[PDB]
Each structure stands twice: as C-alpha cells, then as structure tokens.
C-alpha cells in the first residue's frame, strides 16, 4: 500500500504549484475583502 516509488512532482509540477500559491495569497486578501460585504 504505502511503499513509495519516487516521483518527480516538484519540478514537473513546479509551474502548476506556482499557480496554486499565487491564488492562495490572493484569496487571503480576497477573504478579508469578502468579510466586508
């Protein structure tokens, strides 16, 4: 079951991960903006 076979998911999915991070930060500011509504 849990017996890892290494996967390169840290440079293959580096452009994917970057996109996730940007929206996460923006949603912090958005949450503060949405809590004033």
């Amino acid at each position: 079951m849990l017996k890892r076979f290494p996967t390169p998911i840290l440079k293959v999915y580096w452009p994917f991960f970057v996109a996730g991070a940007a929206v996460y930060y923006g949603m912090s500011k958005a949450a503060d903006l949405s809590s004033n509504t």
Partner: protein
C-alpha cells in the same frame, strides 16, 4: 526436475498472494515499477494482450 515440480506445487497462488511475497523473491517487480513511473508510462507491453485496456471508447 522432480524437485522443480515440488517447488511450484508448494507455491501455487490462485486467489491472492501478496505482491510483497513476489517482491521478496523477485525485487525485479519493484525495479520495473519505479522505472516505469519515472518513464511516464504505466502501460507495460503484454498487459493489454491478456488483461486488456478495460475501456469502451
């Protein structure tokens, strides 16, 4: 050769059998698995000619 028959007879699976027991007698299993995920494959040839590609499309 008589002994050879005995060895498969005491080790004939048919319902289940840990892939770990097969791994313990052959680490070749894990070698291929690791190599294939690295390869960007998950299709290993001959798995589709006797266990299909399990799809209708």
């Amino acid at each position: 050769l008589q002994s050879t028959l005995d060895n498969i007879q005491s080790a004939r699976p048919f319902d289940e059998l840990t892939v770990d027991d097969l791994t313990k007698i052959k680490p070749e299993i894990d070698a291929k698995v690791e190599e294939m995920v690295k390869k960007g494959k998950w299709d290993v040839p001959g798995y589709k000619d006797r266990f299909g590609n399990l799809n209708v499309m």
